[PDB]
């Protein structure tokens, strides 16, 4: 809804012990709501104090390492846990399962405010790096500086500045630093297209998001029906199952100065695609928008194709 004036690249963020489950239906990559919450908390901590606003996230996931295991007689997988401390009587704990993982991801952040006006690009990028190297991303700690001495500094790249051919060339030289991974986009239109062409047989919607992202083996007309890209389930957002509540009327709230609601998880389809397949680098930015008249608390990436 807002075209960013420039783009900042959080180059190679290493993350240990991040949350893997992130949803009651998926277990793989964490939800993009975590990345939108990260850029909003970074806007709170260092973004306001520089006449800068931050809007959305592009994520590419250079590497993934889940703490899982296959239990030796089944094709499924289980989660690896940790030993919690003993109870007050010293008997044992109550085992609640959590899924940890390790991530290597880059972040693409858009800016609209006085970017190059009040401050130069290098000092802005350096203090955003120093700020983000003290917090956590998705439940797990941002792993600090190691013998990766090369990939440290960012690149605050002006989006619309320069010639349009020069714009394509500098965004291509920025995509040159993001080739190892594959970016993530929302695929609501392809979901709706397969939903309408499936509804000739039966009018159901979650069975589509089941049948979109598995290995469908069709018999002899032994073949495998296939989608052209990497189709994954993603948590599409938040839909409220209860009306608006005031800060004080609900007990055990996080804050008695913020209104509360009871919510359910919207699930959708995402897509991992090579970053060279998109020509404008501002297409990948995941924005979260609220429609508080109803329950729709949505994260997506509009203006993508």
């Amino acid at each position: 809804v807002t075209d960013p004036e420039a783009l900042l690249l959080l180059p190679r963020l290493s993350i240990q012990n991040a949350n893997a489950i992130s949803s009651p239906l998926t277990w793989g990559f964490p939800s993009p709501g975590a990345f939108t919450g990260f850029v909003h908390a970074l806007q709170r901590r260092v973004g306001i104090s520089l006449d800068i606003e931050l809007d959305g996230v592009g994520i590419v996931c250079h590497r993934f390492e889940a703490q899982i295991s296959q239990p030796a007689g089944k094709r499924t997988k289980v989660f690896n846990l940790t030993r919690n401390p003993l109870n007050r009587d010293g008997s044992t704990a109550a085992i609640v399962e959590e899924g940890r993982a390790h991530l290597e991801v880059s972040l693409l952040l858009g800016v609209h405010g006085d970017g190059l006006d009040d401050h130069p690009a290098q000092e802005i990028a350096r203090q955003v790096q120093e700020q983000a190297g003290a917090m956590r991303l998705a439940g797990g700690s941002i792993l600090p500086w190691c013998n990766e001495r090369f990939p440290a500094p960012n690149a605050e790249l002006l989006m619309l500045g320069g010639s349009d051919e020069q714009r394509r060339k500098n965004q291509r030289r920025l995509t040159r630093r993001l080739l190892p991974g594959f970016a993530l986009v929302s695929r609501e239109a392809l979901l709706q297209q397969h939903l309408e062409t499936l509804r000739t047989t039966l009018p159901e919607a979650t069975t589509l998001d089941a049948l979109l992202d598995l290995c469908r083996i069709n018999f002899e007309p032994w073949q495998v029906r296939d989608k052209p890209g990497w189709l994954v389930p993603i948590p599409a957002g938040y839909n409220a199952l209860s009306p608006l509540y005031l800060p004080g009327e609900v007990r055990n709230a996080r804050d008695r100065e913020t209104p509360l609601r009871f919510v359910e998880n919207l699930f959708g389809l995402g897509e991992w695609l090579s970053p060279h397949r998109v020509a404008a680098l501002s297409d990948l930015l995941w924005y979260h928008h609220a429609e508080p008249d109803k329950g729709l608390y949505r994260w997506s990436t509009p203006r993508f194709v």
Binding site: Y238, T258, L260
Partner: protein
């Protein structure tokens, strides 16, 4: 909850199929007048228990261990959010995944 009396949950569907006792016992217990099989005391007790079975809590209560989350607003403050575990939804997709992974059609 912690109620081990699952016989009431069984009797909610024991007369629910083909009878209006298991379906009207929660509200509009006019079929519960014959559903009690007795005078007004047993029918009133059955209607009160059926009304108290599926009764909503009303007064909301979060917890420390309930995943309270901030969500930003369009150009303003924040909203607090507490996701519930979609037990009916995960049971529906668990039945679908058991029908996909197991079952005689999938075996054939």
């Amino acid at each position: 909850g912690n109620a081990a009396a699952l016989d009431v949950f069984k009797f909610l569907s024991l007369q629910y199929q083909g009878k209006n006792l298991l379906n009207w016992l929660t509200e509009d217990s006019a079929e519960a007048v014959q559903a009690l099989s007795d005078n007004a005391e047993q029918a009133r007790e059955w209607r009160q228990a059926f009304i108290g079975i599926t009764a909503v809590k009303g007064a909301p209560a979060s917890h420390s261990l309930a995943k309270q989350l901030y969500f930003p607003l369009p150009g303003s403050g924040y909203h607090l959010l507490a996701p519930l575990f979609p037990t009916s939804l995960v049971h529906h997709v668990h039945a679908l995944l058991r029908e996909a992974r197991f079952g005689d059609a999938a075996k054939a």
